[PDB]
Symmetry: C3
Subunit: 475 residues, 3 copies
């Protein structure tokens, strides 16, 4: 039996942000969300999050995650950030006085940490009967981490914080991951003896290691070779570095599953995105939120899709889109903007310089050029001519248009909603449609062409255009 505490109550000062540190995101989750998903997968008996002065802003998201993950997650409050060891004493208050399971402690800013790492921690802890097992790793650059002091036989003696280490300790490259398993009695005992004279003037959880070593208890340090799993995030440089390493792993999983990703370094894929086999993702693409891409699709370059469902065999190139769906075999882009509520049927086309908002577009229908479609329902196998506008705003309110199937509307048609265009109808180029058009009718409104001969010689005399028409009039 085990209780996991997540410490998330420190101020995050080095983020320099008005958004609480554990709420900063990577790969479509907050750091706190990453940490809680990983812990919930382990399924410990108790899960407690220690929050601090911003708890009003974070506690509601912890409840949302508790709901998603199907379990209870308790919140303990730490009134002032007196140190990681004081944060743990706040956390333990959310447990019963007689709790006797193990206690695991982790931070809310270690967002690649995973259930397997935690389960191995807990198995190691039990196997060696430790009073405390601490996860550690080795870094080329240990700056900022507590250093692991070991004797030549590898026995751990202490952890020493960056701010309190001598120049000689600072060269140590093995660091504390800040992830621990504890015998609860030993933990409570050691915590009650923390002192705060040290450079940060805090109650350091890391002091418990040397305290329990002095009592003669078993102190164990388990070395995690994949350092990224226990990397922490104290500022925006570390956060983008871990975002990039998480992304690399997400992309690699899709490549091994059968997705060609031309340039993994510029292809950002959020954790819940799914991609079908033999899809090719071109560079500069981000697939965000709950986007789903089918098989044999072609995506990118320079496409951003957030919660967009794309069926099989579709192409979505140079497109910026969200909360939309794109049918099988459809072609979207280059230079297309999809706003929420767009639904494009199978074999449909939304071409260059087209923007769609809150419209449904039937099977096989094409809106190929320079056109805005807003609040419209269009049927199947229809073609909307270049440079058209579904005029959905009367100056104060939004209005709907309906367009049937097999229609051929002309370039530069303005549909002044509300209007309905019947099946198989045409409009001429340049038509402003202000009333319904029956099935099979042609609607037009532009006046007759008038050619004014010699206008150019009379109104632009001496110009290059006047000289050219003078040349042609001879020749």
């Amino acid at each position: 039996d085990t209780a996991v505490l997540v410490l998330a109550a420190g101020p995050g000062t080095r983020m320099r942000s008005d958004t609480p540190k554990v709420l900063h995101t990577l790969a479509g989750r907050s750091m706190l969300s990453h940490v809680l998903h990983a812990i919930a997968k382990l399924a410990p008996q108790r899960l407690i999050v220690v929050l601090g002065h911003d708890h009003q802003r974070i506690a509601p998201l912890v409840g949302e995650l508790a709901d998603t993950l199907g379990r209870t997650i308790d919140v303990a409050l730490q009134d002032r950030p007196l140190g990681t060891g004081h944060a743990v004493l706040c956390g333990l208050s959310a447990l019963p006085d007689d709790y006797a399971g193990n206690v695991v402690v982790t931070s809310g800013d270690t967002p690649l940490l995973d259930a397997d790492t935690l389960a191995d921690l807990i198995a190691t802890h039990r196997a060696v009967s430790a009073a405390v097992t601490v996860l550690t790793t080795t870094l080329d650059d240990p700056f900022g981490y507590g250093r692991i002091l070991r004797t030549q036989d590898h026995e751990v003696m202490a952890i020493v914080e960056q701010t309190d280490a001598t120049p000689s300790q600072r060269e140590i490259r093995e660091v504390n991951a800040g992830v621990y398993a504890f015998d609860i009695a030993a933990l409570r005992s050691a915590l009650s003896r923390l002192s705060s004279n040290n450079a940060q003037q805090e109650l350091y959880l890391t002091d418990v290691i040397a305290i329990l070593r002095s009592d003669g208890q078993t102190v164990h340090a388990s070395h995690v070779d994949d350092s990224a799993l226990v990397a922490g995030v104290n500022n925006r440089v570390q956060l983008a570095e871990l975002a990039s390493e998480l992304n690399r792993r997400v992309v690699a999983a899709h490549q091994l599953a059968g997705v060609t990703v031309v340039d993994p370094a510029t292809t950002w894929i959020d954790v819940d995105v799914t991609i079908g086999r033999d899809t090719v993702i071109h560079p500069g693409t981000q697939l965000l939120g709950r986007t789903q891409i089918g098989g044999r699709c072609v995506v990118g370059p320079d496409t951003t899709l957030t919660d967009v469902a794309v069926g099989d065999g579709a192409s979505v190139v140079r497109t910026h889109g969200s909360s939309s769906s794109i049918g099988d075999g459809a072609a979207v882009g280059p230079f297309t903007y999809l706003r929420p509520g767009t639904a494009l049927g199978a074999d449909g086309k939304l071409g260059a310089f087209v923007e769609v908002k809150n419209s449904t577009i039937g099977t096989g229908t094409k809106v190929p050029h320079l056109t805005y479609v807003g609040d419209a329902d269009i049927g199947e196998y229809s073609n909307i001519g270049a440079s058209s506008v579904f005029v959905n705003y009367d100056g104060t309110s939004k209005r709907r248009t309906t367009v049937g199937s097999h229609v051929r509307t002309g370039s530069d048609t303005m549909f002044v909603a509300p209007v309905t265009i019947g099946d198989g109808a045409y409009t001429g180029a340049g038509t402003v449609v202000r009333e319904d058009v029956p099935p099979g009718a042609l609607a037009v409104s532009a006046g007759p062409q008038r050619n004014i001969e010699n206008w150019v010689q009379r109104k632009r005399p001496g110009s290059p255009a006047a000289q050219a028409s003078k040349r042609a009039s001879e020749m």
Copy 2:
């Protein structure tokens, strides 16, 4: 005299793809094409490709490459993938029984391998009078490769496959490149003695090394320090890694020749692309296929050109284009889409939100904004006004427009093809051109403006617009 065999008959399972593995591409060639170009440059007497169950899909491309490379390339068939050593025995059947030249064996999934590496292989082989010379290299991560077993004097004894190596062998970091030169008699002899009890249950070509070592023949392993040259591709992660390393080398060659490439990591250049001196290529650009860029051009950012010829001094920014040509000093972009058959003359301009398909546009002519040009021929020094459409589709068929030189057509003009606009003609803003316009004429069709005074107070009473015109009417 030398025969080169390329083994390309395995199933490619770890690609997880419905496209045969050797047909996956990087830098604008398939892996098989890269391997065959490199071998053809060496110009061996015989060149044989061993193909397997997808041979119907690949053999035609081998013939296309034979035609391009000006030589015969034979195909041998291996009915079932019984192992690399059985693949070689299939290959040798395409040679005469009495062939006495050297035999080089390489894989179809080693796409950076180059003629110089092969020539050095063959020279090494002859110089030490080897029965077998194998190329090897050393990797930080040898996972997946056969390991090279050597005694302390560096003599090679054997190769042991990832699947068959002990934990101790697995730490070996020197690996088999899978590229070999053979005395033919020794090869045939060793092959006839392969056994398939091993973990993969295949006939391993790699067993020939320890077989020939046992016979007392000379076995030599030549170490390639540039590992990328002999890196292989078994899955999509390796394929994108080699694509990225090939790309880096292609870009570096253009930089040393005089091309500024702002960000080589996001600039993808295919192998046959040419670029002139002092061109600057901005980030996010891919130059694909047989694109040719002149000197002193400015390209990108975020431009993709496939088979596009661009003359000297031109600018092509934020443009997505293919099978087109762009004249000297022309300006294209930002946000421009060029479809096949676009030809833009010297000093021409295709501006933002413009799409061109199958049209020729003369010297000095400008299509600067929000306009679609399809199936049109336009003369020189003309200007097409913003938001125009060459209406080339009558609802069932495509039709052509012709526009002369020095014309000035108005914004929002629809050219309802087929029509001809004569030299030096104008059209007014808003004109739907349905008949020819003579040289020097002005064509118009919109009706007269009508101002309906007080409409806003009477039809939008109480609105912000009605309140503002009430304010102005006093003031």
Copy 3:
């Protein structure tokens, strides 16, 4: 007291460029500009730039920099590039014969060199009373650099140039940064004894080290651990590598100050750009020149801004823009092109497929779609309908439009400048506005819609559209 000489007179052959090497740029300055800003910060008594045959092209920029940096910068001319040591003798001619301060020598192609590195150089030099102190560093790849010859006690004996080093010297990995402090008498003396038989047949400044060592003077070599600071640039590969390392440092500084940068590798930020706290910069963005971004902005992806001021809380996505300003809380993009002289007020919007040139757009006004705004002044809280054009070109000249506040103009309106639209006026969809529109009026010009019934059955008989209207006419 100290005189700094910058050697910038060599031909730059390996750049392969018609632009002088020291004029190539990174992070929005030339290499020469980077070097002179760093030196001016140190504020030496004298600062001399040695220029060569392109001096006419560079000397004017040195004067511009002298003006910016508030000091005198002298130029000495070297008629032919006879070697770095001859370049220094040209430089010293710009000093008085009796100058007695220290002389620092640096190159114009070491663009990350910084004032602190130079001040430490000069302090080291004085502290050990050196006749010559040379900066050095260690590289994995020392190719191209002079090698530092030291005895086992670390005393420097000589520098040996890439072209003149034996295979054994070439393995040395400690290299000459080409940045030196000199006692002036010792420098003049050693220079007068240079010989040019060496592989390049030049007068090498690097020979002075072994010359002064032979005279028995104190020769000191100060090792710079951050190699990038003293990296040099001889070709376009090195130049893009240093550009990328400079960029990484610029981005990291903004991240530590409170800017989220999603992907530092594809986010290019010039040195004078400023960014406010909690702004998020999405991938593929370049912020160039004197761009200024406020706090809590959202920028990118795939945005390029050059000298653009963006206020707080604004969003600028997929936008290509220069010499413009964007007010607080405004929304620009995706796919928007801003040309010089654009000024968008607070809470304004410039939407997809919109291009603006030389126009002022008031508070709260929206130009949301497919529209070109050129030479226009638009008031507050107005809305310009989709697909409109401010027609600012009469075929020979540019003309201005004025649009009031609270207006609602219709989609597909052409404003044929010069015209004025009064406050609270409307135009209908499809209007060509050729005369002023009073406050509160509705302007229209399209003709009445005409529906031609049965046109499709009579003019497209047998087509899919005719069959669909036949189906509807029953049903």
